[PDB]
Design a protein around this ligand. Structure first.
Ligand SMILES: O=C(NO)[C@@H](O)[C@H](O)[C@@H](O)C(=O)[O-]
Ligand SMILES: O=C(NO)[C@@H](O)[C@H](O)[C@@H](O)C(=O)[O-]
Ligand SMILES: [Cl-]
Ligand SMILES: [Cl-]
Ligand SMILES: [Cl-]
Ligand SMILES: [Cl-]
Ligand SMILES: [Cl-]
Ligand SMILES: [Cl-]
Ligand SMILES: [Cl-]
Ligand SMILES: [Cl-]
Ligand SMILES: [Cl-]
Ligand SMILES: [Cl-]
Ligand SMILES: [Mg+2]
Ligand SMILES: [Mg+2]
Ligand SMILES: [Mg+2]
Ligand SMILES: [Mg+2]
Ligand SMILES: [Mg+2]
Ligand SMILES: [Mg+2]
Lengths: 381, 381
């Protein structure tokens, strides 16, 4: 159907999540944060929606790039439209980002699903209606009883096992935590968690993202003693060669790249060079559901797993449509916060999890985000 | 000295340069364009300045990132400050770009030079006070007598040779030129230029940036028959493997990567994999003078040249401080425009060129941009 409108609505959500100056999430005081909803509408009035930070869909980007590509086009030509946006990034003075591509692609998928009364993963071609989640723990902090000590991680891990998680991923301490980073502290946290949960829970760590080769090597060696299942992004992913070196040295599987640019193209280079043992993708990291699927297929053709970064519907649907991914990433989690409480702007969870640790994909059309339109309207900026 | 202020001044410049929807420059009607000047000031009142597009230094980026890193710090700690910004990019929701790092780093270098009464390339450590420039021709257009036909390129090339350029680089036709791209037309333009200038002028081409492997191969083979000195960015640089393949296949030197992310780190990967025969860097492409110098040094250690993308003082000073770069890129040029007329907001050229094709670096302190502060003040947005 012909796309007639692209609209952004900015509203305030009430949350206890804060992000530090380096972008890491932490629990803090309840406060209002601006959140944006992108809507694509067709001639018959059907809409698709997706959520992102206001800057990613600010008027500069919407007017200069997004509307020019989308308006007047058949909404179903997702490949053509994605490629059109992709070929405009180079000349965009660094303003047309993969994040912008992602929210646009997601809204187009939601539009197609809502139009047809079909969940996105079913339209793609379903693999699984439920999937194991790992509990993805927030970055370390200096909050007493929070994630300040190695024992704090151990205690929280016990809680996650009780909840039903069959896998747990630590994010350890990073600047601006005053004393961070420290390999020995990271390893103490990992050891506390292994001691707490025993050998039959799968454990992963996603550490400070800029350790030197020598520090990441020491971290990896320590993890092998604790039977961890993977090490994630312990070094600057801009150095492919460092990851090749680390993977060759470590027995423990290295997963990546999460944050590196270049979408599926650059991820092929990680396979080619042997820079990782497990690939990584994510809707936000590679510019949408469409390229995330490509990354999943790329990995599958090499007989590799590709673990999907990020919670929310958009990532869950990629995981549900593909086989070669062990988990959905559920979080980030913190003992001070109740993840299962959801968001004020959604009427129900996009990723409810049973007591056995399986997330069940909602049977709602599109991305299945149960949007509280009335709340958004009552809280506009 | 302690940094006390970071300020952005947005002003209108009058220019005939336009950018199409894919970001390519073309000559068009005279119009006003918003330009931004970033200023860093220290406790004693000394200032450094650099220019960029308004979005790159908009309040979001200045307040959330730049001020937090710079304010209260010793202006001379350019390495520490650059690394601080670099380590904040990952968590910036794609808003802290290499372009933002570049303008900040440039302003800091300008500040150090102005404070000491020294040109930046002299502070770095001078290699050459003058350098050969190639005439870098604008992307093709559909303007009669402009760059619409192969013969138009040939005629313009004759003019460039008369001006004194010893080297000429074509940018050929790209979308949204109605019929673009077409390898055979690109090759006709290259042939017209070679016929016009003879065998003793150095010729380069920078083509449509997203040709398939098969098209870029055909382009490269055609260039070999015309004795061209390099082929630049004919394929999506997100595919390192495509560049390894193309370089292995072509006799003509392949230069890159220009636009790929990852700064000097990712450029090391291009050397390691043999993806190019000549490296490429640029102040805007790798996030500043500081990392551009790193890329130059990286290339030199492999006995490679590293050609520096972009005109203006910031790139000229990198070229003047290093040996392993054949040219300064002077342009973009078009028969309808007079490059030597300069900009309304600068009192004189940053890159004047003699009749023998050498650009002479001004002996003015800092980046040596002869800023018309009065004009800027009279034309504020
Ligand atoms: O890595 C992640 N998930 O796996 C994201 O959770 C984050 O960006 C996290 O690593 C961080 O804030 O450093
Ligand atoms: O490649 C360049 N210089 O070499 C820059 O001039 C440009 O981005 C140009 O290629 C373009 O607009 O495609
Ligand atoms: Cl339809
Ligand atoms: Cl249609
Ligand atoms: Cl499963
Ligand atoms: Cl739940
Ligand atoms: Cl509602
Ligand atoms: Cl000083
Ligand atoms: Cl000082
Ligand atoms: Cl802003
Ligand atoms: Cl020279
Ligand atoms: Cl001149
Ligand atoms: Mg991660
Ligand atoms: Mg290994
Ligand atoms: Mg709790
Ligand atoms: Mg170029
Ligand atoms: Mg070759
Ligand atoms: Mg003329």
């Amino acid at each position: 159907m012909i796309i007639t409108d692209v609209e952004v609505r900015v509203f305030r959500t009430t949350t206890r999540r804060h992000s530090d100056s380096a972008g890491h999430a932490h629990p803090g005081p309840a406060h209002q944060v601006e959140q944006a909803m992108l809507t694509v509408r067709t001639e018959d009035g059907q809409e698709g929606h997706s959520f992102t930070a206001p800057e990613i869909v600010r008027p500069h980007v919407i007017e200069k790039f997004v509307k020019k590509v989308l308006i007047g086009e058949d909404h179903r030509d997702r490949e053509r439209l994605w490629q059109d946006l992709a070929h405009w990034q180079r000349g965009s003075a660094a303003q047309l980002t993969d994040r912008t591509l992602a929210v646009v692609d997601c809204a187009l998928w939601d539009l197609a699903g809502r139009s047809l009364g079909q969940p996105v993963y079913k339209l793609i071609g379903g693999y699984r209606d439920k999937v194991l989640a790992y509990g993805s723990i927030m970055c370390g902090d200096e909050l007493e009883g929070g994630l300040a000590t190695p024992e704090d991680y151990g205690r929280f891990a016990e809680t996650l096992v009780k909840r039903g998680y069959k896998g747990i991923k630590l994010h350890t301490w990073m600047p601006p935590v005053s004393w961070a980073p420290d390999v020995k502290m990271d390893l103490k946290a990992c050891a506390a968690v292994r001691e707490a949960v025993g050998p039959d829970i799968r454990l992963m760590i996603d550490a400070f993202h800029w350790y030197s080769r020598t520090d990441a090597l020491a971290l990896g060696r320590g993890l092998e003693k604790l039977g961890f299942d993977w090490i994630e992004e312990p070094m600057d992913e801009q150095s492919l060669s460092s990851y090749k070196w680390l993977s060759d040295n470590l027995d423990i599987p290295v997963v990546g790249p999460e944050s590196a640019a270049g979408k599926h193209w650059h991820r092929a280079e990680w396979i080619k060079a042997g820079a990782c043992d497990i690939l990584r993708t994510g809707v936000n990291d590679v510019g949408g559901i469409t390229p995330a699927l490509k990354t999943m297929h790329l990995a599958e053709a090499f007989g590799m797993e590709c673990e999907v970064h990020g919670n929310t519907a958009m990532n869950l649907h990629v995981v549900a449509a593909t086989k070669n991914c062990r988990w959905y990433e559920r979080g980030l989690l913190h003992p001070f916060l109740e993840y299962d409480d959801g968001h004020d702007y959604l009427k129900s969870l996009s990723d409810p999890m049973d007591r056995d640790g399986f997330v069940h994909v909602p049977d709602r059309p599109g991305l299945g985000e149960d949007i509280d339109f009335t709340f958004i309207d009552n809280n506009r900026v």
